[model samples]
Target: HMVKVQVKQLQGMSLTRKVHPSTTVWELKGEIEKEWCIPRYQQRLALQDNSNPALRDGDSLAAHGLFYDIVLLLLCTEPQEMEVLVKDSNKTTVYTVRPTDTVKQLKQQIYACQHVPVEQQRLTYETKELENHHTLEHYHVQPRSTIYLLLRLR
Candidate 1:
């Protein structure tokens, strides 16, 4: 049987599409990508059913009890690489990072490659300090962007 699916975007838009019960969630994502310009890799779909929560890419519409009319939340995330320059006193090192990578992870990479202590690392991009919780994309950092690093006295 065909199911009527309602996809609610994070942008407050809703799209109604019909799909067969045998249709894979990944196939549905491709349709969404065609219409919404959201890539498959950056799209996540969640069902209204609190029991299941999310539908995996490999799952079928019937497997998640989506055989009937259901509303799914479409989450969009950006994953892109940024060529970031980490500068120390002696030299600067360029690192490639993804938008989903956290500042803490970047610090760890710095500690590994540059021998800088993670706790003593302070990173600034475009003159603003970077927080551990936020990602490089959150800062709007672009490719070949330079991030200055300062080591604390302690």
Candidate 2:
């Protein structure tokens, strides 16, 4: 008895790229290197953020194709290191500081604003959510520290 099997695999993929009206900034360093062989240190990512240049987000690659100019630059470099002032719900306010400031300091500041105790407030960096008890002193904040403050709605 003889048996034969036929297998098919799709090798090429073509996607119809759609344009977006508003663009959000996000780091494309990894994607640029992976897709187009652009080095990180040698690249410099541009900025389109309206306000404070340093406080801009990463740009999306989908909006601009691989053939774009200075794609690697825009993906790699941007102005950073700035402080933000935010108003909390308790009619009090606090300055959103850099990671250089201890987590305890940030917690206390947040407490002053929203009146939420440090034990209840939670912190997040990028997509990873962290508990309030986590301290920021030990973790050396890089020039590109992605810090976000989480408030308890309740």
Candidate 3:
């Protein structure tokens, strides 16, 4: 079964790849090395969202639950147009952003829209909250994701 994978570099260049879940990490490394000359030893493969443990050379991709449409931080998109909807207690506003944007910046953008204090604004999905320093891409957020907004009650 071929799975669609998004490979990213820390440097902001990214490549779309497809691989079988049956493949071992070492085999994936071989492809990476062959394509980019980044030796297997130098490969630092990690799941872009950090939702999974580090890739183990002996582990099959399926064992790690990397089956389909996986986002692998191989890692770089300096800037990509993205829009997310922020649903607060009373309103829903579509916020245009870049994947490179941070939570703090999104808060500021929301501030501009609604005058909420940045320090008091919260951006989250489900039970997990986004840290100010992390990029939206870090959360594996997709376009048009509706983020829950919580304002400081005080």
Candidate 4:
């Protein structure tokens, strides 16, 4: 009797300009830097999802020292256009806003709409209360920035 295994290999960077399936991601970075004639320290590792490195570093797809199969799909598109909606205890209005806006900015806009004193209101986003310094960038607001307006009484 004979034992066999099947593995789905993936295309990856190599020491050569060509792509190969046997290279680890770490090695791929090295290869990319070499091909670009850039120092490793000067190169930055970027991923599509913008995942956190501390969490990603713990994930392993295969046994140690092996380049397990991986596939990356890239897509290009124009930025999504969206309208920002503002609603308070009584009325709701929609306003066009760029995706680059932040939560602090949104809070200010909401305050203007609802006549809420900015210094007196404590705003909570998701499950956490947001401090004044946190921005929309932290929330990863993209094409659609749906902001919920809340007034806390204490």
- Return the top candidate by lDDT: 1
lDDT of 2 by residue, 5-100 (tens): 111113322112222323333333333445555443334554332222342334343343322322112433333333433323334333646434
Instruction: Write down the lDDT that model 4 would get.
Output: 0.44
lDDT of 1 by residue, 35-150 (tens): 98875657778875565345655668887666788888888877656568898888999887886788999999999998878999999987899999998756756456579999
How high is the lDDT of residue 9 in model 2? 15
| Per-residue lDDT value at 78 in model 2 | 39
lDDT of 3 by residue, 1-154 (tens): 6997777787767776688888887677677766776645446678867633777766788888777777777732233476798999998999998867888899999999888889898788756999999987667565566899998756
Backbone clashes for every candidate come to 0, 12, 4, 2
Relative to the true structure, how large is the alpha-carbon lDDT of every model? 0.80, 0.42, 0.76, 0.44
Q: Against the hidden true structure, what lDDT does model 3 obtain?
A: 0.76
Sliding window of 10 residues with minimal summed lDDT for model 2? 1-10
Worst 10 residues of 4 by lDDT: 1-10
Instruction: List where candidate 1 sits over 4 angstroms from the true fold.
Output: 80-154
| Cα RMSDs, all models | 13.1, 13.0, 11.2, 12.6
Q: After superposition, how far is residue 24 of candidate 2 from its true place, in Å?
A: 8.1
Model 2: what TM-score? Answer: 0.39
- Model 4, stretches more than 4 Å misplaced? 1-73, 77-82, 90-92
